[PDB]
Amino acid sequence: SELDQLRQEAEQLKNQIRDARKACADATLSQITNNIDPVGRIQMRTRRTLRGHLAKIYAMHWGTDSRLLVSASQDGKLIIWDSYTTNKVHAIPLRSSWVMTCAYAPSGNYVACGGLDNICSIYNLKTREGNVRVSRELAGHTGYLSCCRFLDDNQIVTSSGDTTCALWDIETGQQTTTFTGHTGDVMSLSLAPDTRLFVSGACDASAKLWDVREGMCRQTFTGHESDINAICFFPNGNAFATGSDDATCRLFDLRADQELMTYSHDNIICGITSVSFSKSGRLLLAGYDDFNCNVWDALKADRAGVLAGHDNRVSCLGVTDDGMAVATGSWDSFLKIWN
Amino acid sequence: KTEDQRNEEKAQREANKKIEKQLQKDKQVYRATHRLLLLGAGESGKNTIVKQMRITSGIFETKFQVDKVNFHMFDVGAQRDERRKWIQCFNDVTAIIFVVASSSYQTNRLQAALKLFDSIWNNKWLRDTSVILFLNKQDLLAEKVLAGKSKIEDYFPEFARYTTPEDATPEPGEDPRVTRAKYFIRDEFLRISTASGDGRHYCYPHFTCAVDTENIRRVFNDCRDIIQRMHLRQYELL
């Protein structure tokens, strides 16, 4: 009775929101983008092939100055590279061999790692002793940690497999804020440039927008058919691209609160692992389980290019803060730089 | 330039050399040690096996010292039953130790183990890694069959036509009926294994009991056979 009444109310509000969504769909993105000129083809070339990792590379991240990067391996090593000269700066041994995410703080001072060990670990790079030592370890989450990002040197956002997201303050070490709205594992999350908002995509074929200060879900974006493996903001912070296992990448915009473009090809059965944008927001890159990276031009959903230098699943793909290069790390223990 | 930056680059190369010299050593350490998964459907004596081979965090790691060969065994706990995402982290393990309770006739928990084993066998990124199958908790298997209170015909309609394999090696003091049912559960797992061609993947059934202690030796031989089978496939041959 009461459960059925609640279900009917949820259904009727869902119908109202669907009608509202359809009301604002005056014209699709295809019509407005038909006029602009296509970019043609982009021939991206490999410059540095970073070697020194034994097991698969599962996560990587760039610095603020687009010089130093971090890669994590399921071998239990966190290697901090300098892509310019292909030296390695810091081979951090990991307490747990299994790692699934790494992050660079936006000051060059701390790095963050996490994985199946259920504990996110912060390592300090500016130790007076000169030896890299673990600073803090946070163990609030129950499910395996999926990804982590830094707001500043003091606050860290973590997304784990317990269908919850958490915001921690490093000094006090306890969960400052919690986010419980998802019905499945929260696979990825991305942060707006203004850092006031962040959107997390989960395995419920849904993404959710959260505000860090207030700690409530603003809008929910649905429309995918499988688990969203990755998601990244637009450079302007007013749109986001989500890639799932249904072999289609979608583009959503916050203000219309609905999808806009449906990048897909009929010959693509393989899924998507990671997505990212360039500085201008024109070119977007998306990794694939079939060991290649397809680059879709701007908006017309035409394959601008293919990057097929890898042998196994590409797991991480990241564009530098100044847009000089794109770094792709795959499961063949090889991390490559393309431009 | 060379006036000011040359020393910085030289120091960076020295740091690279030190890091590489460390990487050689832990590379030897990593490649020398083998790794195994411990997977359990539920109530199949996984903790019993852990205690037998022994001689909050979500992953617990155990060490072996068998025949001067180092083994690491990883179990999964405090993680939700949705395992379609973190199972992909384990495509580099030597083998996945699948522990199944044979007393399963969830009313039919055995079918849950069979369906899960199908997912592991046919998974895209678990095709290379082999699975060691431990039919476990047979101590009461003979008891219920001898008692005859519960039937596997109701939960498995294809047992009645099934006959005892000719190439069977029953243990002494075992009833003929339990021996036939012992190999029926094995053949259900084997039917899944042999259905798929492309022999990069193989299954290793092994009956087990709580009283047994030599489960070290059965794992050691399986890891011996798995690694050499992979070497055979490289050199054409098998």
């Epitope: - | 949705e82 395992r83 379609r84």
Partner: nanobody
Framework: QVQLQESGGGLVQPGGSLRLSCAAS????????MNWVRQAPGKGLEWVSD????????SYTGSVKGRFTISRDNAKNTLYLQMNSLKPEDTAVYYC?????????????????????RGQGTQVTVSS
């Protein structure tokens, strides 16, 4: 939005035939693999039947073997489960589930307590 609606099922006499319908939307019915799972009272989810992408490989659990027929209408995007000669132990809450990824032989996490791609669930009761 990916939603699945289950129709049919109720208090029925034993030995009868019941048809359960799963209507799907928001995704390509052709690409994915359909499963039927049932929830007994006081017990967890147990898998019952499955139908593959094209409709060739069909498998059932032991209890429902020989009495259950699973079919799919790709044009109508409708998954039919036909039940014949029902038994008192067959009462449960049924669920039309979809495996997470398309074009994949494996089909993970269909009996978990919290699964996103599972319907609200129809109720089937068998009693005198």
């Amino acid at each position: 939005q990916v939603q699945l609606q289950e129709s049919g099922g109720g208090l029925v006499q034993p030995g009868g035939s019941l048809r359960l319908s799963c209507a799907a939307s928001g995704f390509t019915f052709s690409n994915y693999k359909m499963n039927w799972v049932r929830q007994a009272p006081g017990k967890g989810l147990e898998w019952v039947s499955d139908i593959s992408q094209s409709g060739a490989s069909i498998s059932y659990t032991g209890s429902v073997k020989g009495r259950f027929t699973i079919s799919r209408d790709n044009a109508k995007n409708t998954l039919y489960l036909q039940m014949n000669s029902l038994k008192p132990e067959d009462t449960a809450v049924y669920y039309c589930a979809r495996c997470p990824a398309p074009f994949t032989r494996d089909c993970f996490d269909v009996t978990s307590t919290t699964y996103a791609y599972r319907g609200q669930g129809t109720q089937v009761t068998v009693s005198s």
